[PDB]
């Protein structure tokens, strides 16, 4: 499945401290409490560290992103 | 007259025998014998009783069988060929046992037992 039926990402309990960060300068991250905290494709250039429980990860958000969840920055299996 | 009710069965049928005197004319499923049956080797196997009893010139035969598949009811034309005829007379009475064409067999797919795979076929082991 997972076709492009559900197009835009308007989710008010997950919107209201990521889109509001345009007016405020970039000196701090967007702090995440899901394995699935996706945001809009209008907000490339931010920091989302994958919530799973004990330390945060290097996420290099660069200019070209379209597809899927954040299970690649902090991977599912982490090779312990 | 000869306007009677016989039957012929193999693999869950309930048949129609529309039979009378004629000349060996054979027919099935509102069609003839050479309409649904043909280009296959079980055709003259039911002529083997029809040559045993010289009835290929003295009766007009319409026996219908349905269900199952294509050729699993080859034995159902075989089933009631003389079921419309030993009702008519006892002339071929003690001379038909050598043919062997009436036994509604139970070497079939009966109840399916759990633990095994199939009818009495067993799973793989050592």
């Amino acid at each position: 499945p997972r076709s492009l039926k559900k197009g835009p990402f308007i989710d008010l309990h997950l919107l209201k401290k990521v889109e509001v960060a345009v007016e405020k300068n970039d000196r701090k991250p967007i702090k995440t409490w899901s394995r699935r905290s996706m945001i809009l494709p209008h907000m490339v250039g931010l920091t989302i560290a994958v919530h799973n429980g004990r330390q945060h990860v290097p996420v290099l958000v660069n200019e070209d992103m379209v597809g899927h969840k954040l299970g690649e920055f902090a991977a599912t299996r982490t090779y312990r | 007259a000869t306007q009677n009710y016989g039957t012929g069965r193999r693999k869950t049928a309930t048949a129609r025998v529309f039979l009378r005197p004629g000349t060996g004319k054979i027919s099935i499923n509102n069609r003839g014998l050479d309409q649904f049956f043909g280009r296959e080797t079980a055709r003259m196997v039911v002529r083997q009783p029809l040559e045993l009893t010289e009835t290929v010139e003295k009766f007009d035969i319409f026996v219908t069988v349905v269900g199952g598949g294509v050729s699993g009811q080859a034995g159902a034309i075989r089933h009631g060929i003389t079921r419309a005829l030993i009702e008519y007379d006892e002339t071929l009475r003690s001379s038909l046992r050598k043919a062997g064409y009436v036994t509604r067999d139970a070497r079939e797919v009966e109840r399916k037992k759990v633990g095994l795979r199939k009818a009495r076929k067993r799973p793989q082991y050592s």
Partner: protein, 98 residues
């Protein structure tokens, strides 16, 4: 645990706490006649209106005993029940034949 059956059984009311704004706003979703300006009001529907609104988090067990396997579409009971039920007679219609 005394509080495992007690902490999940209460979803008979909480998942259906609104249950009407959820029933009205899950039928228009299968209709594309809603406009593109209406791709945001169809998404102020149900969630932070407190999140006992997803039906994905509910599960059944036996009625007296508490077991998820053995449940068929005709009971509220389980597989270690059905051997002990009809033999004293708790199950109607369940006879043994071919």
């Amino acid at each position: 645990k005394e509080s495992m059956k007690n902490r999940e059984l209460k979803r008979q009311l909480t998942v259906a706490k609104y249950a009407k704004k959820r029933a009205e706003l899950k039928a228009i979703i299968a209709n594309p006649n809603s406009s593109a300006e209406e791709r945001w009001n169809a998404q102020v529907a149900l969630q932070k209106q407190p999140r006992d609104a997803s039906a994905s988090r509910l599960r059944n067990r036996c009625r007296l005993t508490g077991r998820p396997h053995g449940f068929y579409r005709k009971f509220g009971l389980s597989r270690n029940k059905l051997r002990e039920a009809a033999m004293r007679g708790d199950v109607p219609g369940l006879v043994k034949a071919s």
